[PDB]
């Protein structure tokens, strides 16, 4: 009857950048989502597979909780089957997704008038990302012209570019935080 | 909240000795603990950030270690002018919260 860490992952300080999405594995708890229901600013509480109202008295198992920071426009890509840059190179959900995708408007917290070049995302990769796997490889992407062996220049590109995250960009460019609960619906461990 | 218990509450050392302080957390904080020093009736200052890295400007004796939920700040070759109350202040989850604070007096 011990609550499980929805506190440690929701009101936390530093969400890690998107190309390395920190992944917390929840187990052996009683997850009360009425703690989230009260917190209103949630820009998009979109649940794919279950409906939020019938979500409390269920009993999940093997529930994960990812987290990252992405542009305000690129928030519409954390969803099953989406196409673009984030879900093809950073974080992709499978076609049979059975969880939820929550979002913030974190312009108060992660935005300095100096260039917040601290968060990054992946720009170039050989192949598309398999579902639910990350790539922290820091090495040059290039067509088979000449292996520059870690030198930036012509036809050699450092993969991880950085966001701007200025507090004057716009509702569509300021950083949005995202938490992706992915249930696995074996004995049920969590409940309400 | 993440309540940080500091032990011991009282201390008794003499100049020229080595002594270590202790501030264990309650939840898992990824080495996001800082250590503060406050003397008698003054603004508390910063000793070491992230529980292991030092602040340019402090003496070369304060140095703490520990990662996870058990942290220790050990001051060696203590000088009598280092008297004061020491505060640990985590930074992982919200709201940020300091410990009760222990006092390091003389004999």
């Amino acid at each position, epitope marked *: 009857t011990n609550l499980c860490p929805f506190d440690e992952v929701f009101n936390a300080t530093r969400f890690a950048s998107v190309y390395a999405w920190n992944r917390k594995r929840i187990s052996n708890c009683v997850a009360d989502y009425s703690v989230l229901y009260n917190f209103a600013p949630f820009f998009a509480f979109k649940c794919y597979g279950v409906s939020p109202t019938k979500l409390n008295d269920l009993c999940f198992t093997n529930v994960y909780a990812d987290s990252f920071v992405i542009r305000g426009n690129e928030v519409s890509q954390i969803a099953p089957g989406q196409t673009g840059n984030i879900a093809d190179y950073n974080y992709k959900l499978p076609d049979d997704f059975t969880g939820c995708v929550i979002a913030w408007n974190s312009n108060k*917290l992660d935005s300095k008038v*100096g260039g917040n070049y*601290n968060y990054r995302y992946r720009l170039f990769r050989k192949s598309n990302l398999k579902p639910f796997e990350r790539d922290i490889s820091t090495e040059i992407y290039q067509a088979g012209n000449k292996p520059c062996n870690g030198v930036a220049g012509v036809n050699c590109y450092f993969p991880l570019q950085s966001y701007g995250f200025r507090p004057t960009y716009g509702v569509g460019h300021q950083p949005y935080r995202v938490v992706v609960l992915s249930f696995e619906l074996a004995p049920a461990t969590v409940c309400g | 909240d993440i309540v940080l218990t500091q032990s011991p509450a009282t201390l008794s050392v003499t100049p020229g000795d080595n002594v270590s302080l202790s501030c264990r957390a309650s939840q898992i904080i990824s080495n996001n603990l800082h250590w503060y020093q406050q003397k008698s009736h003054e*603004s*508390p200052r910063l000793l070491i950030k992230y529980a292991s890295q030092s602040i340019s400007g402090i003496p070369s004796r304060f140095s703490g270690s520990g990662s996870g939920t058990d942290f220790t700040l050990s001051i060696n070759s203590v000088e009598t002018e280092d008297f004061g109350m020491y505060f640990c202040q985590q930074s992982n989850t919200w709201p940020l919260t300091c410990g*009760s*604070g222990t006092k390091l007096e003389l004999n």
Partner: nanobody
Amino acid sequence: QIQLVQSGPELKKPGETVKISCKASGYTFTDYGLNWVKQAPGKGLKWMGWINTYSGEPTYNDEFRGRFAFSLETSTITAYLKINNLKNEDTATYFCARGGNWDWYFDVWGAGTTVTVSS
């Protein structure tokens, strides 16, 4: 030169209001936040909740939700703190420390303003 000079000590009656100043100067005010700390005599520090120095929208610690207001003016580079309905319990010394917007460690503090209540 980096400093945050506050207002002098206060003394008010139960029910009155107070405005405490925290005037920052020396560093670019926008590149950091501002945190407030309340220290009752004989106990530990308490984080009162930061305020984004560019916009000014506060974030109250869930204990000091009401009765406190972190107003901010940016013409003159001075933050504020305003308490309504002073009670018999909040006698303490109120700091204001520049905690960053990405690190959150209070390096440069203020001198410390004291607020006591009496009849």
